[PDB]
Amino acid sequence: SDRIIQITRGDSTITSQDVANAVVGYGVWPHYLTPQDATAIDKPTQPDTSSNRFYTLDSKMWNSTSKGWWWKLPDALKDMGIFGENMFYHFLGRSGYTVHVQCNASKFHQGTLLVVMIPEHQLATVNKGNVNAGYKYTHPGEAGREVGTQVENEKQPSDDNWLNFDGTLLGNLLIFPHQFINLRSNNSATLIVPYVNAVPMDSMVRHNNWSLVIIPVCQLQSNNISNIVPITVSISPMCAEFSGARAKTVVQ
Amino acid sequence: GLPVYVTPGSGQFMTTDDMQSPCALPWYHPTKEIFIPGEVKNLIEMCQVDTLIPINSTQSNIGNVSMYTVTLSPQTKLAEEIFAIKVDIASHPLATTLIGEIASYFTHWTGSLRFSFMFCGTANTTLKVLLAYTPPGIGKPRSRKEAMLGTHVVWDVGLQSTVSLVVPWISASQYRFTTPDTYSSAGYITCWYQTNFVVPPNTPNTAEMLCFVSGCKDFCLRMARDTDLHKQTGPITQ
Amino acid sequence: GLPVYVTPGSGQFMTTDDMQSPCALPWYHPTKEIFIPGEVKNLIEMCQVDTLIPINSTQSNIGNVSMYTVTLSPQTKLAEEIFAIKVDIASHPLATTLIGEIASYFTHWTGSLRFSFMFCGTANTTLKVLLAYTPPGIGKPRSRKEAMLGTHVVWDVGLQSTVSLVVPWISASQYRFTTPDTYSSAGYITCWYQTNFVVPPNTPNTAEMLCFVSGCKDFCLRMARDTDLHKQTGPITQ
Amino acid sequence: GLPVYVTPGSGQFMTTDDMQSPCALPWYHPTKEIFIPGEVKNLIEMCQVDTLIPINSTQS
Amino acid sequence: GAQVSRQSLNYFNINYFKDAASSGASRLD
Amino acid sequence: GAQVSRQSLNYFNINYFKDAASSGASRLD
Amino acid sequence: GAQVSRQSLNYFNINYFKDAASSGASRLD
Amino acid sequence: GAQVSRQSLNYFNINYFKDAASSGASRLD
Amino acid sequence: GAQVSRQSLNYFNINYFKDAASSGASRLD
Amino acid sequence: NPVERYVDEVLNEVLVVPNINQSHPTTSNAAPVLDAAETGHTNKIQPEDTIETRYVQSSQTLDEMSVESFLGRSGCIHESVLDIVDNYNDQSFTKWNINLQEMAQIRRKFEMFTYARFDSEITMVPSVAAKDGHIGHIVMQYMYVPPGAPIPTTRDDYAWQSGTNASVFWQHGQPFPRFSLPFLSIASAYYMFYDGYDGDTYKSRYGTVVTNDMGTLCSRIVTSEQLHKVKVVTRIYHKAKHTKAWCPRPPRAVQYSHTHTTNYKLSSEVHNDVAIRPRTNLTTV
Amino acid sequence: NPVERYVDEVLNEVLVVPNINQSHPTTSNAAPVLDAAETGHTNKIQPEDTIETRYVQSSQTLDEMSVESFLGRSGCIHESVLDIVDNYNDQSFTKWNINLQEMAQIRRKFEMFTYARFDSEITMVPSVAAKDGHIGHIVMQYMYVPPGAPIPTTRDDYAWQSGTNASVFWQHGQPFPRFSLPFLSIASAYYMFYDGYDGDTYKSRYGTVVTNDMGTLCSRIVTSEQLHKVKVVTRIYHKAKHTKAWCPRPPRAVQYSHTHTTNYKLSSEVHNDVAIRPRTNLTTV
Amino acid sequence: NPVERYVDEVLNEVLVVPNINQSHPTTSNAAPVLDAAETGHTNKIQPEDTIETRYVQSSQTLDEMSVESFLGRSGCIHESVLDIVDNYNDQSFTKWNINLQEMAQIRRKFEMFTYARFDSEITMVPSVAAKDGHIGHIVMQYMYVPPGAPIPTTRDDYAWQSGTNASVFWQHGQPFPRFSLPFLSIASAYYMFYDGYDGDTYKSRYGTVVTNDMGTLCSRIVTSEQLHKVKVVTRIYHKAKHTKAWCPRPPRAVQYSHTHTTNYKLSSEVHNDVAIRPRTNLTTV
Ligand SMILES: Cc1cc(CCCOc2c(C)cc(-c3nnn(C)n3)cc2C)on1
Ligand SMILES: Cc1cc(CCCOc2c(C)cc(-c3nnn(C)n3)cc2C)on1
Ligand SMILES: Cc1cc(CCCOc2c(C)cc(-c3nnn(C)n3)cc2C)on1
Ligand SMILES: *C(=O)CCCCCCCCCCCCC
Ligand SMILES: *C(=O)CCCCCCCCCCCCC
Ligand SMILES: *C(=O)CCCCCCCCCCCCC
Ligand SMILES: *C(=O)CCCCCCCCCCCCC
Ligand SMILES: *C(=O)CCCCCCCCCCCCC
Ligand SMILES: [Zn+2]
């Protein structure tokens, strides 16, 4: 059936009996760095199955008033097993991902989530002059950010979901790899994205390559509101490879 | 020396000229090019991708995601109107969509437009809607019967959530101005209830609908110009 | 005459242009070229030759040959730090070495660096030292254990006086700025006692060490610029 | 560079000259030409058609 | 942009710019 | 720097300076 | 407008404009 | 002063003046 | 006025005007 | 054939749009108009699929919509002012930290892409305002000081010698100066956006300021002090040549406030901050 | 042979007129001189048919009478004035709604046809009048603002950045600016006349104003305010290249009164409004 | 193939750097890292010898690091001043004893070699300062007076006739003068350093002054006295072409004090005289 999917990565297998196909960001499947594009000269370490597996983040609750959520990669996985260890023990890292967003309800529920993967999502601050988003705020880890909850601080990023948190209109987010989780149609979204950057490898501690943004564009509604409808995200690195080994970087 | 005749135009600087000039950094070797996914070679590539229309952009909705949805519900009167907009690519509310934004960087446009609609009601909510395109030379239709006489699609909501209506290029001239011009206004798109929004008991009595737009294989823009959809009223500082 | 169109740029003088010009001395015949040993054709030839690092350039040592030596001696605590410097080619104390001076005439650099060390103790003095390179994204190591986790060489002093540590090109970008730039800082080099400085009785209890630097086969500089390591604060007269 | 000799006439603008000049709208593609009846290629075509002489053009 | 004819009387119909609008007066008929 | 084509309609794609950056607008596709 | 002769001593009698009046002094006899 | 190469990609290394000092930057190696 | 030699190293000894007095310095011997 | 290709260049017919083919009435259980936007794909339905079309030969071309064309137009990126008021030595020279973020028009176009690689063509338009009457003989010097090179601190600083840096001298009356610059980045492409920092602390910088340092443009009136004061304004125009772009993104919807940052300001009435014009209601066209 | 054709170009002998042939006395029941103008056709009788002609070799050519030649002459179409009187900021820039209807000489020639298709060559002739004595350094900017693009409202408006619009900068002392423009219409030919409206109501517009919108030409003195005031008058000259014309019509007989309309005014003595000179009577030559 | 070579020139890929090859773990009694600097040779160890490298294709080129490139940039070598104060006849001409030692920037670069052979390109940038208001018609004469030729002692000296010497006349408003000069030495290469004297006595001269006499550059304002006084400053720029260099040496570490000599001055705090920045201690990075 075209409604079913099974994704196996390492020791993890994920299923969904109601999918809306899958999207491969920019039509390029993730792959290891080739010698023509490489620059760092040491031999890369490729953890393979111990890092290229599904990691499930903290679930979130979707309710009639939710404004959205966002996570940044590789930040969201910094504390996830072997993948996490490798990004702190090495200066350089490189990786692609399989993002599987999960959200089931019922045939009597309605709502629509816009799931987007944005490359270089450079967040903006509102009405704060040239003060930019602080490191701490753009590195929430697996918890991600719940739009419209954080008590504003100077270095706090924009929480304007309609302006993509960066000064552009929400309706045009569709130009980026995306999918919709329309409760009447599917209960999951799957996006496979390749490594995208202006350099072959980069610091995973100071540069977030992709941003996962989930905005409910159609309010969650049903006649059984007491039943909690969560949103769970499982992300699997792909072709992860690291270089420049040393002691473990400790942030903060 | 070789006798030459300096022609008018010499020494002028035209921002759109195409000449050669000496390189300030001789011998410099540019950084090796690496493969980066997502290369774009022509803006048409961006015009063929669906983006949401802020169709419900009433003053109270602007600044809210709700400006992107149209609400449907059980009607008590038959054939009621749902929405109506101009087909003109750079008119409002089409202007800020990706295709509208790009069209605003050009003076002429041509081609067919693709409007898609996705229903967001429950899996148990049914509905049949009539989407119509009214070619110019007449006012927007005042009733479903009037609209139905033009180009139209009857959309039946079911397993497949989305439907597409194509607004054919029907014009006297090969191109139209992107800016609002009486002579080149392209017509209207109206939506009407074909039957009615029906739901079983214990099911939300309203549902949303999302609207998309992109260009067909024949879409084309011409004569580059600066956009009027963005301005600079002061210096941009550090 | 042939109709011509004078293009922008005409009549300007760009210090890096490459044009031809009439010779002021027509018919003049230059002096015959004779063979002279030592022709240099590319600056890379000079970057591949070891020169001493003024590593011990504390204010009190500057102006003394001692600014070029590091003193070693029997330790009472194990794994003590000997020295630490930045790997950045144009940072201090690397700046005034021949490779640092040449790198300062360029804006970008890339490639691996070769650091050599020559022990000056007596033939009867033994020692094992750990030389380590710490890639960026972390502070300089605070202990031998911390440094040892990065790239390193354990140097055993014996008949052959000199050892070489290669700092591999480990960077995100293909090039780095020669000038101190946070984004492109290359890391650190630290030296620690692996074992200890040991001598027989009646032998000096301290010894010196010399430090050299040169570029590997992949070293390369780009985008010529004027150096900031030399200035002119007044006229140079006769 | 190639030695040149600027000749008299240079830089002048003669309304009947026939030179080339850069196009202000690069890459622009003109609208397709369609067939239209009545093309005229030379004014002689108009001189060969009879027209009335206002021969009795007295002031009244 | 050079239309080189030969007869020797060689013709050089050069087009200096890359847009058709840039060329001079048209030939006749 | 001359790319001489022939068809006669001869093309002369001359590159007057020795650095690639110096040339004009790129061809398409 | 180029009258290319060859003898090598090649002659290039170029006519830069399209009207005969535009050319220089006439040849003799 | 013209060094005409062919490959068609024809090279025209012209030397406009008669003294070697007049030419531009030298080639490398 | 063009003395085209070939060796390829092609020489173009052009005489731009029609009077011998107009040419540059003479060759030697 | 390079000659055929050449003709296409001259006529601007390199990229032609497809024709519309004649279609007919249909009665099928294959419904192209129905699809699922959830997939993240655009339904590729064409006019022939929803109405009965006639055959039409297309003559439109997409050449002008190419990235080369879109970004290949020279626009102003900086206005340098040298206003001689009361101190010639101090007011006859200045410097600018180079960037393509100070002018909205070209900035917005480049920012419709995430990464871009291109060569640059710079054209300068100097205009000398005779504040006191005469302008004398104005000669300008524009020196490019790459990051690291000594920045002149006086109008006669030794750095002006330009022993290695590229300088362009312009003499009033001569045509506008112009030169080209190869792709300058240390990376493979320029970052239009950069979700990263130059460190991992609360005080680390965020954004393209970390990656896009192009150095400094130092200008000075070469001419020594003159009786009559002048105001020289040099407008720098920039055009991209031999361009490549990756990962398109939404166009800037609100005004720019600063360089190297996506920051913006919103008023109490946000509809005034965006180009969206409020609709009376859903059915008012 | 392109070379033979080339010679014809140089000599202007592309279109030769036919010879006159020798004719003789005739006595026939075929009368070429008799015909019927009712048919709407011109009797094609030639001199050989009505008199005894001699043989004569024609050497006249019709090249100069070609449409290309007729319309291929540069004529003035606009005189732009920038007169600095008392407010530099307001008086140093202006705009014009482009059209070829403001100058009678070229207008009348184009209007001898119903439709015309051509490329344009624009040449500008700026003249700076030194009202107070000196002119300083005058640099001009002519920006073409296609319909829809933002029109600058101040001399420092951001629109002047010309990030996409085509601008031409001229420096006083340099040769006259000149550039070409491809056929700009959205239709296949320009309408010289248009018997139509932009709607079907009593207030709909009539005529070419509906179809011939070319946008706006915005000009400004780039140079900042100077001590001495100047008056810059820029005359725009237009020439048609690669021309085609359809359906010839009668030449304008009375003066023009407005642009985009055939409207005219008549005095009480109409013979003064037309070029016809009153005859004394039928037999007074 | 000269065409392939040509492409390399255009792309600046004449001198490519070698690739890094993949290496593996080793356990051997051959220790490349160990050597003996006493030999005076640099250990040629490469990265593959000390760590496990991956294969990487190099795309860097050394073209820009060539001696031709290093010294092939035009830099200022002299600033000639003609300041008309109170005596035109005396102040309208001057002379300079030619040398490349007066400006630190280019001097330091040439002095990184012991001997150098090259042709010269000279470009002059004259700027006329209107001290009293107008500049009139300024025409300059730059005459090269080889050692031995008569040096003019007045502005109308017969030597200005330039019957044999090379003179360059510049007219204000015309582009910057420029000419080339063949290798001028009487030897096979220019001496950048010379450990010798012009004799063997206590008063013999030492250094390059003995070997590097290039003669005199004599300048004069050709124009006769004008009402308004002017200050003409001519900046001479020099570039080496077709260069060859021998025996590289250490770069100048302290400021230059005089021409033709390596002499220097030291303060009481020598760390201020060199570019070395004092370190806090051996372990403070
Ligand atoms: C991304 C990105 C790319 C760029 C480079 C813009 C080019 O910048 C300049 C400019 C505007 C002028 C000069 C300049 N002006 N005069 N000289 C001799 N050089 C040099 C550079 C690098 O800036 N940001
Ligand atoms: C019919 C018909 C055809 C035309 C077009 C006339 C050309 O109009 C202009 C002119 C006169 C100047 C400029 C112009 N001036 N300066 N620039 C950069 N563009 C642009 C156009 C379209 O107008 N009516
Ligand atoms: C070593 C070494 C090599 C040189 C020669 C420098 C070139 O010197 C000049 C200059 C700067 C100008 C002129 C000159 N200026 N104007 N004319 C006609 N000649 C002639 C020479 C030899 O000086 N030292
Ligand atoms: C046409 O598409 C290109 C136009 C090129 C202009 C340059 C014309 C001069 C060519 C001289 C080449 C001499 C041949 C060896
Ligand atoms: C390309 O690498 C060199 C460019 C040379 C510029 C000069 C072009 C004009 C050539 C005319 C030669 C005529 C042939 C006999
Ligand atoms: C004659 O009818 C046309 C005159 C053309 C003028 C241009 C002459 C220069 C031609 C250079 C071409 C070089 C050949 C490859
Ligand atoms: C070299 O020794 C002489 C240099 C000649 C300069 C003129 C170059 C232009 C040649 C154009 C000839 C076109 C061929 C028919
Ligand atoms: C000699 O008698 C005539 C000199 C002609 C001067 C023009 C030289 C340039 C020739 C270019 C022709 C290019 C060949 C196709
Ligand atoms: Zn005056």
PDB file of C-alpha atoms and ligand atoms in Angstrom, chain C residues 2, chain E residues 10-14 16, chain F residues 12, chain G residues 1-2 14-16, chain K residues 6, ligand 6:
ATOM      1  CA  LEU C   2      36.203  52.319 -37.048  1.00  0.00           C
TER       2      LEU C   2
ATOM      3  CA  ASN E  10      35.258  40.676 -48.020  1.00  0.00           C
ATOM      4  CA  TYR E  11      32.271  41.972 -46.081  1.00  0.00           C
ATOM      5  CA  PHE E  12      32.258  42.145 -42.278  1.00  0.00           C
ATOM      6  CA  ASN E  13      28.783  42.664 -40.930  1.00  0.00           C
ATOM      7  CA  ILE E  14      29.751  42.784 -37.238  1.00  0.00           C
ATOM      8  CA  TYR E  16      29.061  44.321 -31.422  1.00  0.00           C
TER       9      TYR E  16
ATOM     10  CA  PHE F  12      34.180  36.071 -32.224  1.00  0.00           C
TER      11      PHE F  12
ATOM     12  CA  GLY G   1      33.672  46.994 -46.121  1.00  0.00           C
ATOM     13  CA  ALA G   2      36.911  45.233 -46.708  1.00  0.00           C
ATOM     14  CA  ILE G  14      38.020  49.047 -45.323  1.00  0.00           C
ATOM     15  CA  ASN G  15      34.901  51.112 -45.791  1.00  0.00           C
ATOM     16  CA  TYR G  16      33.580  51.812 -42.273  1.00  0.00           C
TER      17      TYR G  16
ATOM     18  CA  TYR K   6      26.406  44.886 -50.015  1.00  0.00           C
TER      19      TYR K   6
HETATM   20  C1  LIG M   6      32.254  46.615 -44.178  1.00  0.00           C
HETATM   21  O1  LIG M   6      31.230  46.607 -44.890  1.00  0.00           O
HETATM   22  C2  LIG M   6      32.110  46.452 -42.646  1.00  0.00           C
HETATM   23  C3  LIG M   6      33.105  47.185 -41.873  1.00  0.00           C
HETATM   24  C4  LIG M   6      33.344  46.528 -40.577  1.00  0.00           C
HETATM   25  C5  LIG M   6      34.169  47.393 -39.641  1.00  0.00           C
HETATM   26  C6  LIG M   6      34.948  46.479 -38.663  1.00  0.00           C
HETATM   27  C7  LIG M   6      36.364  46.226 -39.202  1.00  0.00           C
HETATM   28  C8  LIG M   6      37.199  45.450 -38.176  1.00  0.00           C
HETATM   29  C9  LIG M   6      37.084  43.954 -38.499  1.00  0.00           C
HETATM   30  C10 LIG M   6      37.897  43.089 -37.521  1.00  0.00           C
HETATM   31  C11 LIG M   6      37.559  41.583 -37.720  1.00  0.00           C
HETATM   32  C12 LIG M   6      38.762  40.724 -37.306  1.00  0.00           C
HETATM   33  C13 LIG M   6      38.645  39.382 -38.039  1.00  0.00           C
HETATM   34  C14 LIG M   6      38.602  38.110 -37.271  1.00  0.00           C
END
